[PDB]
Amino acid sequence: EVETFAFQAEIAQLMSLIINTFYSNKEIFLRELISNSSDALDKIRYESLTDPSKLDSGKELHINLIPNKQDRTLTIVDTGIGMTKADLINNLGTIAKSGTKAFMEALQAGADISMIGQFGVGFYSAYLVAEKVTVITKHNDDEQYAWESSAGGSFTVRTDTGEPMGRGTKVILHLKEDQTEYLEERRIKEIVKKHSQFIGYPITLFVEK
Ligand SMILES: O=C(Nc1ccncc1)C1CC1
Numbered sequence: 001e002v003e004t005f006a007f008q009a010e011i012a013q014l015m016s017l018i019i020n021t022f023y024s025n026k027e028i029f030l031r032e033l034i035s036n037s038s039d040a041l042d043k044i045r046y047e048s049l050t051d052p053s054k055l056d057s058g059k060e061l062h063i064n065l066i067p068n069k070q071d072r073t074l075t076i077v078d079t080g081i082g083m084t085k086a087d088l089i090n091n092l093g094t095i096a097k098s099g100t101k102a103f104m105e106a107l108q109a110g111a112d113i114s115m116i117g118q119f120g121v122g123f124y125s126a127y128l129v130a131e132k133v134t135v136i137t138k139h140n141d142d143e144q145y146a147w148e149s150s151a152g153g154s155f156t157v158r159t160d161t162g163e164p165m166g167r168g169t170k171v172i173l174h175l176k177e178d179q180t181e182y183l184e185e186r187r188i189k190e191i192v193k194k195h196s197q198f199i200g201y202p203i204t205l206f207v208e209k
Pocket residue numbers: 017018021107113114116124125128
């Protein structure tokens with residue numbers, strides 16, 4: 001049972017700008033997704049300070065980067081607070097409509113495109129490198145769900161029958177044909193060191209056979 005939803009117009013417009021604007025600095029997608037994971041980890045850590053049972057779904061707070069050259073996917077896994085079904089539908093837990101508006105106003109006032117994450121919509125920078133994004137998520141208060149979009153104005157949400165996750169979020173980037181440099185260990189290591197070197201959770205880059 002798959003539900004198909006239209007993006008709000010303002011979000012669809014931001015996605016079309018990300019996909020169609022000529023912009024060579026595509027590597028910042030990973031900084032943005034790691035930053036989002038760090039924010040989600042901070043949220044479950046804070047909730048656990050007064051309710052330790054919130055970590056019954058998993059005590060380890062970490063970020064894994066999993067390239068798969070056979071599937072041409074880069075997966076960013078975190079064990080943060082995760083998202084409910086309602087969060088997924090509501091722009092993956094973001095204030096994307098007002099965030100997009102503030103980002104566009106900032107660009108008019110001289111901000112850089114790379115500042116997207118300051119406006120709460122850094123997730124959508126995934127489409128700098130991905131033709132399709134799949135988000136699998138488990139929040140303590142809901143079941144495990146899969147969100148997916150290839151842009152084009154729509155996204156889908158379904159219950160996920162896949163490998164149970166415990167708690168957290170997995171962002172699966174189905175990379176564009178010409179963006180497979182982001183599956184190479186040395187390139188991923190370089191971008192993490194450049195942009196994400198002080199994140200306060202362990203970031204493990206998996207290697208491949
Ligand atoms: O936001 C981005 N591009 C963009 C291009 C033109 N106008 C607004 C935004 C990319 C960083 C993700």
